[PDB]
Amino acid sequence: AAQTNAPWGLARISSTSPGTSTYYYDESAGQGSCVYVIDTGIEASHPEFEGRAQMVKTYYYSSRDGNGHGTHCAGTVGSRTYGVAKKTQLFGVKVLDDNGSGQYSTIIAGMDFVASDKNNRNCPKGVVASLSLGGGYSSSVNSAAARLQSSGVMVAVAAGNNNADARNYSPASEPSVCTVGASDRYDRRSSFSNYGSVLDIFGPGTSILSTWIGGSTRSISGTSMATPHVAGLAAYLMTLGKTTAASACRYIADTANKGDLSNIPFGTVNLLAYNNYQA
Ligand SMILES: [Ca+2]
Ligand SMILES: [Ca+2]
Numbered sequence: 001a002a003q004t005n006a007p008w009g010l011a012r013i014s015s016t017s018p019g020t021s022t023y024y025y026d027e028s029a030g031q032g033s034c035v036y037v038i039d040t041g042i043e044a045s046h047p048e049f050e051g052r053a054q055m056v057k058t059y060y061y062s063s064r065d066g067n068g069h070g071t072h073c074a075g076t077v078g079s080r081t082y083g084v085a086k087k088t089q090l091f092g093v094k095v096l097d098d099n100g101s102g103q104y105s106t107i108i109a110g111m112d113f114v115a116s117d118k119n120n121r122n123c124p125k126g127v128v129a130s131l132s133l134g135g136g137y138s139s140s141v142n143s144a145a146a147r148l149q150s151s152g153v154m155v156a157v158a159a160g161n162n163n164a165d166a167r168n169y170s171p172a173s174e175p176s177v178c179t180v181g182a183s184d185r186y187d188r189r190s191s192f193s194n195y196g197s198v199l200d201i202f203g204p205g206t207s208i209l210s211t212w213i214g215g216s217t218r219s220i221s222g223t224s225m226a227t228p229h230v231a232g233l234a235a236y237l238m239t240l241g242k243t244t245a246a247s248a249c250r251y252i253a254d255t256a257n258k259g260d261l262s263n264i265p266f267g268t269v270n271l272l273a274y275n276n277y278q279a
Contacts, residue, residue, distance in 0.1 A: 001027045004200060008185050009204030009229055010144055010158035014275050016257060018187045024133030024277045030085025032125035035077045035229070035234040036114045036153070038107070039070030039132060040100055043213050046071065048079035053090040057113055059106045066098030068213045072220060075133045075211030078236070082210040082217070084232025085239075089123070096133060107133065108144040115151040126238035126245050129230035131157040131171060132224035138170040145171035154245040156180055156231040158223035165196035173198050178234075178249035182206060182226040184271060189263040193223055198267060200249050202261060203229035203273045230273050237275075248255070 003010065003023040036056075043065050044053040053074060054128070055063040058272045079087040095110035113160055118127045124149060127272040128272035134157065135141075144239045154175040159166045166172040167171035172179050172194065179198050182190035182205020189195065190206045206224035212218040234248040256271035264270045 001025055003030070007209045009208050010084065012054050012082065012204050013229060013233060013273055014277050017214050018185065025236065025275060026069055026277060030088035030232070030235040032123070032239045033085065033128065034089045034091060034118070034121055035085070035128040035130060035231055036091045036093055037070055037074045037077060037130050038093045038095050038110050038114065039073055040067040040098065041094035042071045042074045042090060042094040043071045043211070044092065045270040046215050048081055048211050049090065050080055052088070053092065055092045055094065056117060057110070058094040059110065060094060060097055063094060067096070067100050067216065069100055069132070069224065070094065070096065070158060071213050072128060072180065072210045072218065073224060073228045076208065076225060077232040078131060079143050079211050080204050084229055084236040088232070088235045091121070092247035098129065102133065103134070103139050106140055107139060111144040111148045114153060115148050117147055118153060126154065127152070128154040128156065128235050130228050130229050131155065132227045134160050134169050134204065135160055135171070137168050137173060140160050142174035145174045146176045149176050150183035152245050154178070154234045154248045156227050156234065158227045159194040161192040161198055162194055163192055166194040166198050167196050169194060178230060180223060180227045180230045182223045183261055187260050187262060189261055191219065195265050199268055200269050201230055201253055201256060201269065201273050223230050233273050235273060
């Protein structure tokens with residue numbers, strides 16, 4: 001399948017080169033897989049989700065996304081127009097308030113919840129969790145992420161936006177999960193992207209168009225935007241049978257575009273997520 005005039009990041013993930021505008025992908029498109037978006041919530045009624053999204057848990061008074069961030073991320077995972085895996089199932093877990101803040105104890109609870117909840121869902125092709133959040137180093141936060149991964153969920157987390165070594169940030173610094181940095185249109189590390197030896201992969205994170213609340217759309221930037229590209233890619237690859245939750249991060253690193261990025265500090269991987277799609 002091919003999506004013409006696609007958002008630049010979708011084109012980027014299906015190309016060996018920057019500057020293309022068509023997103024090429026297998027029509028299986030992640031059907032059979034499930035992605036948990038742990039964030040501010042998801043506006044499940046947005047037409048772009050096509051009834052494939054649902055809220056499954058809140059930690060606040062309401063289950064609605066009053067912020068937009070969670071909806072944007074979800075849209076990059078699996079909306080019709082803006083998503084990597086256009087037929088995946090989306091589940092929203094609202095751990096962040098409408099200001100986009102959360103306490104670590106509630107994000108830990110949200111991770112433990114997913115590890116359990118996936119056992120009552122029909123996800124024949126596998127389960128992914130996308131965490132476009134983080135703060136200062138916390139061993140308890142890292143351990144929650146490690147548990148989620150070990151339960152059999154592909155965990156993808158944002159590297160963070162401090163232009164610093166991600167080793168000081170959680171859950172970014174947990175080695176066992178898939179830590180994602182951000183790149184721009186021109187194959188440059190995004191100027192705000194964290195780096196360091198803990199990063200596993202880069203995805204598109206500058207000026208990413210996706211869904212927003214109120215049934216709208218918006219372009220925003222961050223490692224928060226890069227993360228769902230990789231979460232969506234994993235979902236896509238698991239339904240193709242190429243990889244499993246336990247080895248998806250390694251598989252995407254093994255099959256990435258290598259050495260394409262500029263502004264990569266010595267000691268950080270030079271790997272950009274790529275779907276390897278072949279007509
Ligand atoms: Ca290249
Ligand atoms: Ca890792």
